[PDB]
Amino acid sequence: GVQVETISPGDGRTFPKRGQTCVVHYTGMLEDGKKFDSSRDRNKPFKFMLGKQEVIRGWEEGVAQMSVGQRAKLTISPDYAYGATGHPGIIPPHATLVFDVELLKLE
Amino acid sequence: GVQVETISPGDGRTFPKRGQTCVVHYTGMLEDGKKFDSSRDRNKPFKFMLGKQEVIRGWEEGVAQMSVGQRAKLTISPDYAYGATGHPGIIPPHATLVFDVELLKLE
Numbered sequence: 001g002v003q004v005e006t007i008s009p010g011d012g013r014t015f016p017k018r019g020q021t022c023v024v025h026y027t028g029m030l031e032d033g034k035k036f037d038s039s040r041d042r043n044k045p046f047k048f049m050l051g052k053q054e055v056i057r058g059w060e061e062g063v064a065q066m067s068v069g070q071r072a073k074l075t076i077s078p079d080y081a082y083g084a085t086g087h088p089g090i091i092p093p094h095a096t097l098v099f100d101v102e103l104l105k106l107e
Numbered sequence: 108g109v110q111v112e113t114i115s116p117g118d119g120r121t122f123p124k125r126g127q128t129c130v131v132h133y134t135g136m137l138e139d140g141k142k143f144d145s146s147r148d149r150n151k152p153f154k155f156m157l158g159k160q161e162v163i164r165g166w167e168e169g170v171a172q173m174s175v176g177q178r179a180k181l182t183i184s185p186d187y188a189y190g191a192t193g194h195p196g197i198i199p200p201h202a203t204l205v206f207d208v209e210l211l212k213l214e
């Protein structure tokens with residue numbers, strides 16, 4: 001599944017609802033901290049909606065537990081990410097992923 | 108993992124080696140037989156190589172057990188396919204997939 005560990009607290013009152021646009025900043029890493037991608041590097045947040053298979057399941061379940069302004073680490077098991085296949089030439093088979101995510105706003 | 112059930116036998120001697128081009132015909136279905144895709148419908152075989160993350164793991168492990176001319180049903184568990192996410196708007200979360208595959212030739 002997914003484990004959420006909070007780095008900085010959110011407002012504790014505004015949680016994402018299916019159908020809302022989530023705006024975030026993320027950094028993706030392997031369990032040893034090796035970085036594979038970051039929206040921060042591109043200077044552009046990533047936007048997605050819950051409930052439309054727009055993101056891997058670990059995000060669908062992890063982001064729903066965050067409130068606006070929260071910064072958290074999401075640890076995602078392989079089945080909730082790229083499973084036994086991985087992602088071609090970036091993520092190996094059976095990898096648990098770690099994402100540092102910040103929920104900037106809901107729109 | 109993956110289960111291979113043979114419909115028509117292969118030559119029993121030519122098995123795919125990593126680095127070879129596999130040429131196949133396939134039909135993808137859910138466990139109840141509902142078809143989601145088929146190369147047969149397009150009149151064009153599908154070509155891929157083992158060992159390059161070009162296909163879901165259930166195929167990487169299942170096709171390697173087939174010999175040229177064999178026709179088999181591959182039953183693939185979710186982690187060896189699209190896991191808890193599925194494939195956007197085609198395959199639901201946690202689905203076991205069934206592929207009817209025919210190994211036409213190796214090149």
Ligand SMILES: CC[C@@H]1/C=C(\C)[C@@H](O)[C@H](C)C[C@H](OC)[C@H]2O[C@@](O)(C(=O)C(=O)N3CCCC[C@H]3C(=O)O[C@H](/C(C)=C/[C@@H]3CC[C@@H](O)[C@H](OC)C3)[C@H](C)[C@@H](O)CC1=O)[C@H](C)C[C@@H]2OC
Nearest residue numbers: 028037046054055056059081082087090189192193194195
């Ligand atoms: C068509 C292009 C479209 C690309 C964009 C919108 C780009 O803007 C995004 C910034 C994507 C990033 O591009 C730089 C890049 O992000 C990674 O680096 C990454 O950090 C990651 O894991 N992320 C991205 C941040 C959210 C979680 C996760 C994801 O859910 O990503 C999604 C993902 C790949 C889902 C698979 C879909 C097929 C399912 O079957 C499978 O189910 C197992 C899951 C991704 C958002 C797709 O929905 C949409 C796209 O692919 C991926 C390793 C590879 C990916 O590039 C492709």
Ligand SMILES: CC[C@@H]1/C=C(\C)[C@@H](O)[C@H](C)C[C@H](OC)[C@H]2O[C@@](O)(C(=O)C(=O)N3CCCC[C@H]3C(=O)O[C@H](/C(C)=C/[C@@H]3CC[C@@H](O)[C@H](OC)C3)[C@H](C)[C@@H](O)CC1=O)[C@H](C)C[C@@H]2OC
Nearest residue numbers: 082085086087088135144153161162163166188189194197
């Ligand atoms: C860039 C376009 C490129 C498209 C082609 C070469 C097309 O010619 C192929 C005929 C693909 C088919 O297009 C009509 C179509 O096939 C499905 O319908 C399907 O039956 C399927 O499941 N197949 C296809 C036959 C081999 C097994 C499996 C697969 O391995 O497919 C691979 C797959 C999606 C892997 C994911 C990669 C990201 C990983 O992270 C993730 O790991 C979980 C696994 C597919 C071959 C990709 O490598 C390459 C592409 O996507 C998919 C449901 C969706 C897919 O369209 C995308």
